[PDB]
Amino acid sequence: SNQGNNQQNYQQYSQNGNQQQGNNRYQGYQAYQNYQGYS
Amino acid sequence: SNQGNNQQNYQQYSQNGNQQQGNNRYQGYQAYQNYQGYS
Amino acid sequence: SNQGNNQQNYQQYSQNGNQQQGNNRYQGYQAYQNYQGYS
Amino acid sequence: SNQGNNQQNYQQYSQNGNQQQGNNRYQGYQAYQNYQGYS
Amino acid sequence: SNQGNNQQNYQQYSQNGNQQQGNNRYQGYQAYQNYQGYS
């Protein structure tokens, strides 16, 4: 609970990489040639 | 609950990468040649 | 619940990447040559 | 529930990528050569 | 429930990508050469 001054900077840069900006809560889980360049 | 001044910056940059800006809650889960350039 | 001043910036940039800006809640789940450039 | 000043910016840019700006709730699920450039 | 000042900006830009600006609720589901440029 922000009761003041809050600034947050979220930058994600990848390649073939899954990206999540968030939270994950688990209550009951059962489981079993590219070119990129930046100038 | 924001009771003040809240600024948040969400930037996601990828390639072949799934991107989610959010939260995930699990209550009962059962499971079993590209070119990109930025100037 | 925003009771103040809230500004949020959501930017997603990808290629062949699925993009979701939101939340996912699971209550009962059972499961089993491109060119892009930016100037 | 927004009780104040709320501004949110949602920008999604991709290629062959499915894009959703929203939430997904699952209660009972059973499952089994392009050129693009921006100046 | 917006009880104040709410402004939201939804921009989706893709190619061969399905785009949805909304929410999806699942209660009982059973399942089994283009050129584009922007100046």
Author numbering:
A (entry chain E), B (entry chain C), C (entry chain A), D (entry chain B), E (entry chain D): 4 to 35, 47 to 53
What do the authors report?
Yeast prions have provided an experimental system for obtaining a better mechanistic understanding of the prion strain phenomenon. It has been shown that the yeast [PSI+] prion state is caused by the formation of amyloid fibrils of the translation termination factor Sup35. Interestingly, Sup35 can form distinct fibril structures, or polymorphs, that underlie distinct [PSI+] prion strains. To understand the atomic basis of the prion strain phenomenon, we determined cryo-EM structures of Sup35NM Sc4, Sc37, S17R4, and S17R37 fibrils, revealing markedly different fibril core structures with distinct amino acid packing.
First, we determined the cryo-EM structure of the Sup35NM wild-type (WT) amyloid which forms at 4°C, termed Sc4, to a resolution of 3.1 Å. The Sc4 amyloid core consists of four β-strands formed by the residues S4–Y35 in the N-terminal region of the prion domain (PrD-N) and the amyloid core region was approximately consistent with the previous observations by the H/D-exchange NMR and mass spectrometry analyses. The cryo-EM structure revealed a short β-strand formed by residues Q47–S53, which was not detected in the previous studies. Instead, Sc4 fibrils showed intramolecular interactions only in the limited region spanning Q14–Q24. Remarkably, the Sc4 amyloid, which is almost entirely composed of polar residues (right), has a stabilization energy of + 3.1 kcal/mol per layer. The poor stabilization energy can be explained by the fact that intramolecular interactions in each layer primarily involved a small number of residues such as Q15, Q22, and Q24.
